[PDB]
Enzyme design. Structure first.
Site, mmCIF file in Angstrom:
data_model
loop_
_atom_site.group_PDB
_atom_site.id
_atom_site.type_symbol
_atom_site.label_atom_id
_atom_site.label_comp_id
_atom_site.label_asym_id
_atom_site.label_seq_id
_atom_site.Cartn_x
_atom_site.Cartn_y
_atom_site.Cartn_z
ATOM 1 N N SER A 153 0.892 -1.127 0.000
ATOM 2 C CA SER A 153 0.000 0.000 0.000
ATOM 3 C C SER A 153 0.925 1.170 0.000
ATOM 4 O O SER A 153 1.462 1.520 1.050
ATOM 5 N N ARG A 154 1.082 1.862 -1.154
ATOM 6 C CA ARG A 154 2.108 2.873 -1.302
ATOM 7 C C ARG A 154 1.667 4.077 -0.506
ATOM 8 O O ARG A 154 2.490 4.778 0.079
#
Lengths: 115, 498, 187, 114
Positions: free
Chosen positions: B363-364
């Protein structure tokens, strides 16, 4: 208008084929502008296919295109702005501001294709 | 004279603007002779009643994709341009309704209370229209929340092999949004839009029943395009779902949109391209497959004060049939999306059910969309696990390894078991904070692997009874004070074992 | 073999019909009369605009025969068979195409040639004649073959001249010379 | 219907017919080619226009002489159903194989269904 008036013949996607007037053909890598309520849609000429019927690739998006729609010719590669007035602002593919600090007003413009 | 009269006699005598007479039928894709003036993507009503949008405006003969069967169609009929690009009713009336692709209620709770109509494509909110995200949302699955924190406006691609509870992962998110749903605030309230593409009516029907059971059907909208329903309509189904989402977002209200599965959308567009004879890309999925997916996914946002304040949250889902993420359609999507939520089949059998393999899950957007308290507790949860993965890999050999590595090995084993999630059970974040504290501060490292499951149930009960002050505070303050952490420390210790 | 191979895409079958018009050699005069049939098609174009309209099947072929009944018979039985063939292949968009091509074959047999002297601007009539003369006084028009030299105006084709006829040209324009001058003074 | 046509081409088991009527039996209609092979059951799948349809042929196309008459069944194949089809083995054409005589049926139904 321009004598290089082309009427769309086939929208099959991004590919939009245009039917320019005879003897009044453009050149590969040109930029066509089609006046639209979305601004001017730019189509990059990528082939000549015969009898002043080109097959161009769209740069910007398409929809609601009336097939047979008059096509003006910019005459060459998309012209962006260049300058140090391009510093510190968001610009887009056709060179339009996304930060919307008004037009990127610049002394000079240049084509996208350069050697 | 006589030949010109007779010529006029055998001639159609129509300029075929606004109309054209069909010629050459079959393959569910028509070709008309006529339609000289036609707008692109417009809806054309064939006079066998069937309506079909137009995707090829090839010279003289328009290639019109039917939204119905061609068995209705018979060659030589007239088609008359509706003159309208496709549009959908959008409204709050969709809440507690199943609707088909054209928005016709297939739940049969009759006509939608549609507060608007929308257009098939509506451009994504720009750079400036978005607010910079800071909206946490928790799925009730501890691994998801902790390891890959979900926010609102971001796209997180749920990927893993088909129907390995592929549906069930998504539904878990929906169930924890009850906590927000109960909550009065509209910024809390996610009006959740579940899109089911290519899926059978029975599956969906079971799903709506489950939703009704869990009483979430209320704040749920179900957009459906079952397998039987037309391929153009399937292609059009995410984009008109998206329009409903943009309306919520515009209203300032928050929502979440599940797009399950985009993979069948690709097959639909493949069918169209190959029967429009348009050049088929890698794996025969067309060259502008990317264009469709990118525009759809980039419509997700959180808006600033320029417009609304709503945020559509997106969860795209791709079920990797081959399990091959290097395939063209997953690869394209992976680049587009802000996260991957990889699941592993082997770990499903290993007993995490659902099983999430967080090695390939990212999950950037990260922990700005994670609750501050939960950021603190799961801070070294990641470190321990990361160490565990390496340590575990050498450790299977069966040799008596060095003790430091087995400190990791022993701790790590307990963590995995602690994490384990069971279907149809969402977890309250206030009661996910203690479990992660306990584990991270190693109070459960000693507790035997076998009885971790036993301990968990009891521990929550013991806290619910005794340290219920703690639970209230975790909910109320959403960041854990030093005092609260210490109190929690003592509490965990207080329940030494069950 | 017909004088000059067209390459003959579709219309080339009709060019082979022009070879058959030399074979049943009254078909050479049939190419003049078929030019009269093309003149009938030139009176046709309100109906010709309808004739580009597709889908006239056996009824389309009968309608074409009705236009033929309006005709006097230019191009004869070969032209009637071509009307049936074109009807059978169902295309009016290569109807006039066959006409133009048959015209090329016909005027090749006649031996007429077509040249052009594209220039930036129009040229003197004295100039026109002098170049036609020159061409006759060159092997290009060996004499025994006619010429229709057409000066064309195309300022895009910059100053000077380009003469064209056959696959043979002399291009004494400005642009090419300027190009060469530049190149060497950049070397 | 008594719409006849002839078989213009026989490209595999995907025969092409050229109907005389410009009314071409709709997609998913069924056609019978009248032969010493009985009927051949074909199902129109494309109209290629020109009053020339292209038809899927369910039964074998061997021995076909070009220009062979067709007759239009006029719709999707109508099967035979009944409770007296119980204990019957039926072929694709819907006819015995176990030869429990002619299929006792009251209602005959289109193969395709919504």
């Amino acid at each position: 208008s321009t004598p290089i008036t082309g009427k769309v013949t086939a929208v099959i996607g991004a590919i939009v084929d245009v039917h320019f007037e005879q003897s009044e053909l453009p050149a590969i890598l040109n930029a066509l502008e089609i006046k639209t309520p979305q601004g001017k849609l730019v189509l990059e000429v990528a082939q000549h296919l015969g009898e002043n019927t080109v097959r161009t690739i769209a740069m910007d998006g398409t929809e609601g295109l009336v097939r047979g729609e008059k096509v003006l010719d910019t005459g060459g590669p998309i012209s962006v702005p260049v300058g140090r007035e391009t510093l510190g602002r968001i610009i887009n593919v056709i060179g339009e501001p996304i930060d919307e600090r008004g037009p990127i007003k610049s002394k000079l413009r240049k084509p996208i294709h350069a050697d | 004279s006589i030949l010109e009269e007779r010529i006029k006699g055998v001639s159609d005598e129509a300029n075929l603007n606004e109309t054209g007479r069909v010629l050459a039928v079959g393959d569910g894709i028509a070709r008309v002779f006529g339609l000289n003036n036609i707008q692109a993507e417009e809806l054309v009503e064939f006079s066998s009643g069937v309506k079909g949008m137009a995707l090829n405006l090839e010279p003289g003969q328009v290639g019109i994709v039917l939204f119905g069967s061609d068995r209705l169609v018979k060659e030589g009929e007239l088609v008359k341009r509706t003159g309208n690009i496709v549009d959908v009713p959008v409204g709050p009336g969709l809440l507690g309704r199943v609707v088909d692709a054209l928005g016709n209620p297939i739940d049969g709770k009759g006509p939608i209370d549609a507060a608007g109509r929308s257009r098939a494509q509506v451009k994504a909110p720009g750079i400036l229209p978005r607010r910079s995200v800071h909206e946490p949302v928790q799925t009730g699955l501890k691994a998801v929340d902790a390891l890959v924190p979900i926010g609102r406006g971001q796209r997180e691609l749920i990927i893993g092999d088909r129907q390995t509870g592929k549906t069930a992962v998504a539904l878990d998110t929906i169930l924890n949004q009850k906590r927000w749903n109960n909550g009065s605030d509209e910024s809390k309230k996610l009006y959740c839009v579940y899109v089911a593409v290519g899926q059978k009516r029975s599956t969906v029907a079971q799903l709506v029943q489950t939703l009704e059971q869990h009483d979430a059907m209320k704040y749920s909208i179900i957009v459906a395009a079952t397998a039987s329903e037309a391929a153009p309509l399937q292609y059009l189904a995410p984009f008109t779902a998206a329009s409903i989402g943009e309306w919520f977002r515009d209203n300032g209200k928050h929502a979440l949109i599940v797009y399950d599965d985009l993979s069948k959308q690709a097959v639909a567009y493949r069918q169209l391209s190959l029967l429009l004879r348009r050049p088929p890309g890698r794996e025969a999925y067309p060259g502008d497959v990317f264009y469709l997916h990118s525009r759809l996914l980039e419509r997700a946002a959180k808006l600033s004060e320029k417009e609304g304040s709503g945020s559509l949250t997106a969860l795209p889902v791709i079920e990797t049939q081959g399990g091959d993420v290097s395939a063209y359609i997953p690869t394209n999507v992976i680049s587009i999306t802000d996260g991957q939520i990889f699941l592993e089949a082997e770990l499903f059998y290993k007993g995490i059910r659902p099983a999430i393999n967080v090695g390939l899950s990212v999950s950037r957007v990260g922990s700005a969309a994670q609750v501050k308290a939960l950021k603190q507790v799961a801070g070294s949860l990641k470190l321990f696990l990361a160490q565990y993965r390496e340590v575990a890999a050498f450790a299977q050999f069966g040799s008596d390894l060095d003790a430091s590595t087995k400190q990791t090995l022993v701790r790590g084993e307990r963590l995995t078991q602690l994490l384990k999630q069971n279907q149809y059970s969402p977890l309250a974040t206030e009661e996910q904070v203690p479990l992660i504290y306990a584990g991270v501060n190693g109070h459960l490292d000693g507790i035997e692997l076998s009885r971790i499951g036993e301990f968990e149930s009891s521990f929550l009960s013991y806290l619910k009874s005794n340290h219920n002050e703690l639970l209230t505070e975790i909910r109320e303050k959403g960041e854990l004070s030093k005092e609260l952490l210490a109190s929690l420390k003592s509490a965990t210790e207080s329940f030494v074992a069950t | 073999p017909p004088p000059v191979r067209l390459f003959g895409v579709e219309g080339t079958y009709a060019t082979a019909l022009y070879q058959a018009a030399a074979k049943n050699s009254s078909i050479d005069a049939a190419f003049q009369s078929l030019q009269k049939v093309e003149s009938t098609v030139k009176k046709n174009p309100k109906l010709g605009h309808l004739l580009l309209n597709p889908a006239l099947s056996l009824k389309d072929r009968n309608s074409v025969i009705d236009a033929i009944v309006e005709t006097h018979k230019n191009l004869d039985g070969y032209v009637v068979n071509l009307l049936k063939v074109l009807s059978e292949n169902n295309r009016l968009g290569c109807f006039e195409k066959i006409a133009s091509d048959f015209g090329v074959l016909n005027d090749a047999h006649n031996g007429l040639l077509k040249g052009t002297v594209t220039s930036a601007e129009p040229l003197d009539p004295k100039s026109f004649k002098r170049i036609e003369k020159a061409l006759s006084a060159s092997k290009l028009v060996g004499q025994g073959k006619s010429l229709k030299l057409e000066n064309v105006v195309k300022p895009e084709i910059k100053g000077g001249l380009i003469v064209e006829l056959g696959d043979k040209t002399v291009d004494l324009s400005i642009s090419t010379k300027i190009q060469k001058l530049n190149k060497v003074l950049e070397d």
